[PDB]
Design a protein around this ligand. Structure first.
Ligand SMILES: [Ca+2]
Length: 312
């Protein structure tokens, strides 16, 4: 897709036996030239790079320190770890969204940073702080974290986000500011319809006429005790209603489980989906049962059946 370009690569053909610096949580990927980049949760937003998409190495971070303005939104924030970044390339500009918050609370704000290139070796490399995108406070019934931008088939950009509380949110963005359009309304598109409303990390992609909403169910961040799972639903309209393979509404716990983990990789979640031709990859993290539950990067080929539903 134009905003997540990967060129001509047959994802199904390469061997995704990842090696190197694989500690990652809430990842997203971008490719520029022949280099691959992973952005994920960590101090100032952690960055990893690879020459082939298989062998990874730490590259640094986006922000040297917590941008000043963030402190006004989340006063309690006493460390520099930013979460769940999202990235897309539009009009020659890289838009990187990130979350500023504290665990289990909804006093949060999603920020935006831009750059013309992802290669730090380029003298033009520079992440610019573009300020607040959308926020939430204790009085709101949603949480402003876990952003994801997608463009509908009409070329209009939309921002989905959310974690617990009322669930997954969706709002229309302005192409110029890449921030919520002044007259845009906040919509709720997915919820476990249960408490705790364990649903978060939305990621939307368009595929052969349908918008697929990928989300993570249950509990992350508990190492080998994690119960994280990747679920998916779809809709012909980006605003919903999203439903799973069984036809269950995603506003009532609906969602087809794509992966619930195994004996080695526990609690897989917070995914991203990217295409190249008809091929695609599922990107996420999982807690390594053999390595003290360490969050680990996973990149695997993602197939699609006749009805249009994805599978690993
Ligand atoms: Ca995400």
């Amino acid at each position: 897709v134009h905003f997540h370009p990967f060129g001509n690569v047959n994802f199904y053909e390469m061997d995704w036996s990842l090696k190197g610096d694989l500690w990652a949580h809430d990842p997203v990927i971008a490719k520029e030239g022949s280099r691959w980049y992973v952005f994920h949760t960590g101090s100032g937003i952690q960055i990893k790079t690879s020459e082939d998409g298989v062998h990874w190495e730490n590259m640094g971070r986006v922000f040297p320190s917590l941008p000043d303005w963030c402190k006004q939104y989340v006063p309690e924030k006493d460390e520099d770890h930013l979460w769940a970044p999202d990235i897309c390339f539009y009009n020659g500009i890289y838009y990187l969204y990130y979350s500023v918050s504290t665990f289990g609370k909804n006093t949060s704000v999603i920020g935006l940073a831009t750059n013309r290139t992802l290669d730090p070796r380029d003298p033009d490399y520079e992440w610019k702080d573009m300020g607040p995108v959308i926020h939430s406070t204790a009085s709101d019934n949603y949480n402003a974290i876990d952003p994801n931008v997608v463009f509908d088939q009409e070329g209009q950009p939309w921002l989905s986000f959310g974690s617990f509380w009322s669930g997954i949110q969706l709002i229309q963005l302005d192409t110029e500011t890449m921030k919520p359009a002044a007259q845009a309304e906040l919509l709720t598109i997915a919820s476990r319809g249960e408490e705790p409303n364990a649903i978060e990390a939305p990621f939307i992609v368009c595929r052969n006429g349908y918008y697929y909403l990928f989300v993570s169910f249950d509990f992350c961040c508990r190492g080998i005790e994690s119960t994280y799972k990747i679920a998916v639903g779809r809709s012909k309209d980006i605003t919903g209603p999203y439903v799973d393979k069984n036809g269950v509404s995603m506003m009532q716990g609906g969602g087809t489980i794509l992966d619930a983990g195994n004996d080695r990789w526990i609690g897989p979640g917070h995914c991203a989906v990217y295409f190249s031709g008809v091929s695609a990859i599922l990107v996420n993290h999982a807690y390594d049962a053999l390595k003290n539950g360490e969050p680990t990067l996973q990149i695997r080929p993602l197939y699609w059946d006749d009805e249009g539903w994805p599978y690993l």
